Short mmCIF file of all heavy atoms in Angstrom, two decimals:
data_model
loop_
_atom_site.label_atom_id
_atom_site.label_comp_id
_atom_site.label_asym_id
_atom_site.label_seq_id
_atom_site.Cartn_x
_atom_site.Cartn_y
_atom_site.Cartn_z
N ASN A 14 103.07 101.56 104.39
CA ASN A 14 104.45 102.06 104.75
C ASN A 14 105.39 100.89 104.81
O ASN A 14 106.58 101.04 104.43
CB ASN A 14 104.39 102.88 106.05
CG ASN A 14 103.73 104.20 105.81
OD1 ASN A 14 103.74 104.75 104.66
ND2 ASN A 14 103.19 104.82 106.88
N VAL A 15 104.97 99.72 105.28
CA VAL A 15 105.89 98.56 105.30
C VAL A 15 106.13 98.12 103.85
O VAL A 15 107.27 97.82 103.46
CB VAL A 15 105.31 97.41 106.18
CG1 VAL A 15 106.09 96.13 105.92
CG2 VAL A 15 105.38 97.83 107.62
N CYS A 16 105.07 98.08 103.01
CA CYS A 16 105.25 97.71 101.60
C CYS A 16 106.29 98.61 100.93
O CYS A 16 107.04 98.12 100.03
CB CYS A 16 103.88 97.80 100.95
SG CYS A 16 103.84 97.46 99.17
N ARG A 17 106.35 99.90 101.30
CA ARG A 17 107.24 100.79 100.63
C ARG A 17 108.69 100.62 101.05
O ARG A 17 109.63 101.06 100.32
CB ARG A 17 106.79 102.24 100.87
CG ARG A 17 105.54 102.64 100.10
CD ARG A 17 105.78 102.89 98.65
NE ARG A 17 106.43 104.19 98.47
CZ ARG A 17 107.18 104.52 97.42
NH1 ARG A 17 107.47 103.69 96.40
NH2 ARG A 17 107.58 105.78 97.28
N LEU A 18 108.97 99.99 102.20
CA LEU A 18 110.31 99.93 102.73
C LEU A 18 111.34 99.30 101.71
O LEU A 18 112.40 99.91 101.60
CB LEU A 18 110.39 99.11 104.05
CG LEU A 18 109.81 99.76 105.28
CD1 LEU A 18 109.79 98.81 106.46
CD2 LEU A 18 110.58 101.04 105.65
N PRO A 19 111.02 98.25 100.98
CA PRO A 19 111.98 97.74 100.00
C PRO A 19 112.02 98.57 98.71
O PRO A 19 112.89 98.24 97.86
CB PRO A 19 111.52 96.31 99.76
CG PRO A 19 110.03 96.26 100.10
CD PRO A 19 109.93 97.25 101.26
N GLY A 20 111.12 99.55 98.57
CA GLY A 20 111.14 100.41 97.42
C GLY A 20 110.01 100.07 96.44
O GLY A 20 109.97 100.63 95.37
N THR A 21 109.05 99.22 96.83
CA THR A 21 107.98 98.80 95.95
C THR A 21 107.26 100.03 95.43
O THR A 21 106.93 100.92 96.19
CB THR A 21 106.96 98.01 96.78
OG1 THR A 21 107.65 97.03 97.57
CG2 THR A 21 105.91 97.34 95.90
N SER A 22 106.93 100.07 94.13
CA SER A 22 106.17 101.14 93.61
C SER A 22 104.89 101.47 94.37
O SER A 22 104.15 100.51 94.82
CB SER A 22 105.59 100.82 92.17
OG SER A 22 104.75 99.88 92.21
N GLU A 23 104.55 102.74 94.49
CA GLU A 23 103.31 103.10 95.12
C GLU A 23 102.05 102.42 94.57
O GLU A 23 101.16 102.02 95.33
CB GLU A 23 103.12 104.65 95.03
CG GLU A 23 104.08 105.38 95.96
CD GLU A 23 103.76 106.85 96.19
OE1 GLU A 23 103.00 107.49 95.43
OE2 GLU A 23 104.33 107.41 97.21
N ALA A 24 102.05 102.23 93.23
CA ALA A 24 100.87 101.67 92.63
C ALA A 24 100.62 100.19 93.07
O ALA A 24 99.51 99.81 93.27
CB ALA A 24 100.97 101.71 91.13
N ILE A 25 101.73 99.46 93.26
CA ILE A 25 101.60 98.09 93.77
C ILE A 25 101.24 98.09 95.22
O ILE A 25 100.39 97.27 95.66
CB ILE A 25 102.87 97.26 93.52
CG1 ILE A 25 103.00 96.83 92.07
CG2 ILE A 25 102.95 96.04 94.34
CD1 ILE A 25 102.00 95.75 91.63
N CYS A 26 101.85 98.99 96.02
CA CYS A 26 101.46 99.07 97.45
C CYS A 26 99.97 99.47 97.57
O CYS A 26 99.32 99.04 98.56
CB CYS A 26 102.37 99.92 98.23
SG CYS A 26 104.06 99.31 98.32
N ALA A 27 99.49 100.30 96.66
CA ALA A 27 98.07 100.67 96.67
C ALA A 27 97.10 99.52 96.45
O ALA A 27 96.20 99.27 97.26
CB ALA A 27 97.87 101.75 95.62
N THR A 28 97.34 98.72 95.40
CA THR A 28 96.44 97.62 95.22
C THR A 28 96.62 96.53 96.32
O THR A 28 95.66 95.82 96.61
CB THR A 28 96.59 96.96 93.83
OG1 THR A 28 97.96 96.65 93.64
CG2 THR A 28 96.03 97.90 92.74
N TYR A 29 97.78 96.48 96.92
CA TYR A 29 98.04 95.51 97.95
C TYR A 29 97.27 95.87 99.21
O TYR A 29 96.86 94.94 99.98
CB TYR A 29 99.59 95.45 98.23
CG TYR A 29 100.10 94.90 99.52
CD1 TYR A 29 99.98 93.53 99.80
CD2 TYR A 29 100.72 95.71 100.44
CE1 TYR A 29 100.50 93.03 101.01
CE2 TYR A 29 101.19 95.17 101.63
CZ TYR A 29 101.06 93.87 101.92
OH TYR A 29 101.52 93.37 103.14
N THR A 30 97.07 97.15 99.53
CA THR A 30 96.53 97.60 100.72
C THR A 30 95.12 98.21 100.72
O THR A 30 94.48 98.31 101.79
CB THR A 30 97.33 98.75 101.37
OG1 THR A 30 97.40 99.84 100.48
CG2 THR A 30 98.70 98.23 101.78
N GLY A 31 94.73 98.68 99.54
CA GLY A 31 93.49 99.44 99.45
C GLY A 31 93.68 100.93 99.51
O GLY A 31 92.72 101.67 99.36
N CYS A 32 94.96 101.37 99.72
CA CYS A 32 95.24 102.78 99.59
C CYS A 32 95.12 103.17 98.08
O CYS A 32 95.06 102.32 97.19
CB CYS A 32 96.65 103.11 100.15
SG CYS A 32 96.89 102.67 101.88
N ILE A 33 95.13 104.47 97.91
CA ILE A 33 94.94 105.04 96.56
C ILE A 33 95.99 106.09 96.31
O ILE A 33 96.56 106.66 97.26
CB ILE A 33 93.55 105.63 96.32
CG1 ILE A 33 93.26 106.84 97.23
CG2 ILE A 33 92.51 104.54 96.50
CD1 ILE A 33 91.95 107.57 96.88
N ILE A 34 96.29 106.36 95.04
CA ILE A 34 97.23 107.44 94.60
C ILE A 34 96.35 108.42 93.85
O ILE A 34 95.60 108.02 92.91
CB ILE A 34 98.30 106.90 93.71
CG1 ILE A 34 99.21 105.83 94.27
CG2 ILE A 34 99.26 108.06 93.35
CD1 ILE A 34 100.04 105.14 93.20
N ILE A 35 96.45 109.71 94.23
CA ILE A 35 95.71 110.76 93.53
C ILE A 35 96.72 111.81 93.11
O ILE A 35 97.77 111.99 93.70
CB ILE A 35 94.60 111.34 94.41
CG1 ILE A 35 95.19 112.01 95.66
CG2 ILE A 35 93.57 110.32 94.76
CD1 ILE A 35 94.21 112.90 96.45
N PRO A 36 96.33 112.59 92.07
CA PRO A 36 97.21 113.64 91.56
C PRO A 36 97.24 114.86 92.46
O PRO A 36 98.21 115.67 92.38
CB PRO A 36 96.76 113.88 90.16
CG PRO A 36 95.34 113.42 90.06
CD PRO A 36 95.25 112.23 91.09
N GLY A 37 96.11 115.08 93.10
CA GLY A 37 95.92 116.26 94.03
C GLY A 37 96.60 115.98 95.36
O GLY A 37 97.32 115.02 95.52
N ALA A 38 96.40 116.94 96.33
CA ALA A 38 97.00 116.85 97.67
C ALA A 38 95.95 116.65 98.80
O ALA A 38 96.40 116.54 99.92
CB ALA A 38 97.79 118.13 97.87
N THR A 39 94.75 116.57 98.38
CA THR A 39 93.50 116.55 99.29
C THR A 39 92.82 115.21 99.29
O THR A 39 92.01 114.99 98.43
CB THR A 39 92.48 117.69 98.92
OG1 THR A 39 93.10 118.93 98.72
CG2 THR A 39 91.40 117.89 99.96
N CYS A 40 93.14 114.49 100.37
CA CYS A 40 92.53 113.14 100.40
C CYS A 40 91.07 113.31 100.81
O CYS A 40 90.73 114.15 101.65
CB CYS A 40 93.24 112.25 101.39
SG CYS A 40 94.89 111.86 100.88
N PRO A 41 90.19 112.49 100.22
CA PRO A 41 88.74 112.52 100.55
C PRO A 41 88.46 111.86 101.88
O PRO A 41 89.20 111.14 102.48
CB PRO A 41 88.14 111.77 99.35
CG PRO A 41 89.15 110.71 99.02
CD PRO A 41 90.48 111.41 99.20
N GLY A 42 87.22 112.14 102.36
CA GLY A 42 86.75 111.70 103.69
C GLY A 42 86.70 110.18 103.90
O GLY A 42 86.76 109.68 105.03
N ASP A 43 86.61 109.43 102.79
CA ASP A 43 86.58 107.96 102.92
C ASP A 43 87.96 107.33 102.64
O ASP A 43 88.07 106.12 102.74
CB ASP A 43 85.53 107.29 102.09
CG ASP A 43 85.59 107.55 100.59
OD1 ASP A 43 86.19 108.56 100.28
OD2 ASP A 43 84.99 106.71 99.87
N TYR A 44 89.00 108.20 102.46
CA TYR A 44 90.39 107.76 102.45
C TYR A 44 91.16 108.76 103.30
O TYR A 44 92.06 109.47 102.83
CB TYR A 44 90.99 107.71 101.05
CG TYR A 44 90.39 106.55 100.25
CD1 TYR A 44 89.24 106.68 99.53
CD2 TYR A 44 91.08 105.34 100.21
CE1 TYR A 44 88.68 105.61 98.86
CE2 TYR A 44 90.55 104.25 99.51
CZ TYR A 44 89.36 104.40 98.86
OH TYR A 44 88.81 103.32 98.15
#
């Protein structure tokens, strides 16, 4: 969420943090 404050793309914030982007709406148990 801090990464996103300046408007950084989700994909970059994902690799920066270990978060993931999925096409669905249902996050898995290990995320």
Side-chain angles (χ1 to χ4, degrees):
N14 290 332
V15 168
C16 178
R17 289 284 286 158
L18 288 172
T21 314
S22 66
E23 288 193 343
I25 284 289
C26 296
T28 54
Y29 162 69
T30 58
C32 303
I33 65 173
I34 303 166
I35 62 167
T39 311
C40 294
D43 58 338
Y44 290 84

